[PDB]
Design a protein around this ligand. Structure first.
Ligand SMILES: [Mg+2]
Ligand SMILES: [Mg+2]
Ligand SMILES: [Mg+2]
Ligand SMILES: [Mg+2]
Ligand SMILES: [Mg+2]
Ligand SMILES: [Mg+2]
Length: 169
RNA sequence: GGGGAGUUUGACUGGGGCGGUACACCUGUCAAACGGUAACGCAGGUGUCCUAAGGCGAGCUCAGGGAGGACAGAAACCUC
């Protein structure tokens, strides 16, 4: 059949967005250290609304990206607590789906009384071999039409691989 | 120390004074497809700021919009 149309997870991005900066944000950074085995990166204050206590140039959220077998393992750990029920509204038109979970105690982490209670967003992006064209510098080119992931293809791949159930939104 | 002595009381201006600076320097139109071209013609500005907001080299692409993700809501952060 298709020679090299096998779908594959390009990366898995975890993101923890807290309200205020300080000790809680530092702890939300420490939790990702043991969750992903790598140092996260801080994102801060794209704007200034002041309606809930943020300003310009203030550390707000932490995030990171995992690729490869570790990304697949983290996605499996997330779908474990998710129990493999995804809604129809979780999938985007491009083929990327995210679910989000509750506080990270259900992932299999030893609870620490000093860290606190934080969750993550757990956004997943799907890909195919050949999507690295739009990322290189020597020559840039669009993906195309028959190669880009569709809407139904993502949920079909999810049902085929992880045997999850798709609920109507 | 106007008791006394000397001298001055800017210019433009639809009379003069008051008002204003068209009195020094810029942007667009007036301005009639080279340049130049007036009115107290119009619409606006300037007497500052920067050891970086100068120089070089590298990396990246912005404003906005569309579809998604726990608290998240028109606007928080992540991804396409
Ligand atoms: Mg006299
Ligand atoms: Mg006169
Ligand atoms: Mg002429
Ligand atoms: Mg001329
Ligand atoms: Mg350059
Ligand atoms: Mg581009």
């Amino acid at each position: 059949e298709n020679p090299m149309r096998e779908l594959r997870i390009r990366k898995l991005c975890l993101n923890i967005c807290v309200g205020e900066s300080g000790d809680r944000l530092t702890r939300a950074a420490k939790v990702l250290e043991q969750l992903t085995g790598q140092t996260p990166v801080f994102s801060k204050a794209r704007y200034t609304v002041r309606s809930f206590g943020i300003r310009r140039n203030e550390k707000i959220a932490v995030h990171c990206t995992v690729r490869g077998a570790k990304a697949e393992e983290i996605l499996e750990k997330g779908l474990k607590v998710r129990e493999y029920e995804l809604r129809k509204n979780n999938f985007s038109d491009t083929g990327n789906f995210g679910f989000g979970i509750q506080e990270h105690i259900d992932l299999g982490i030893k609870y620490d009384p000093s860290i606190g209670i934080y969750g993550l967003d757990f956004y997943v992006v799907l890909g195919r071999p050949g999507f690295s064209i739009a990322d290189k510098k020597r020559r840039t080119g669009c993906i195309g039409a028959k190669h880009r992931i569709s809407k139904e293809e993502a949920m079909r791949w999810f049902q085929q691989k992880y045997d999850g159930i798709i609920l109507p939104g």
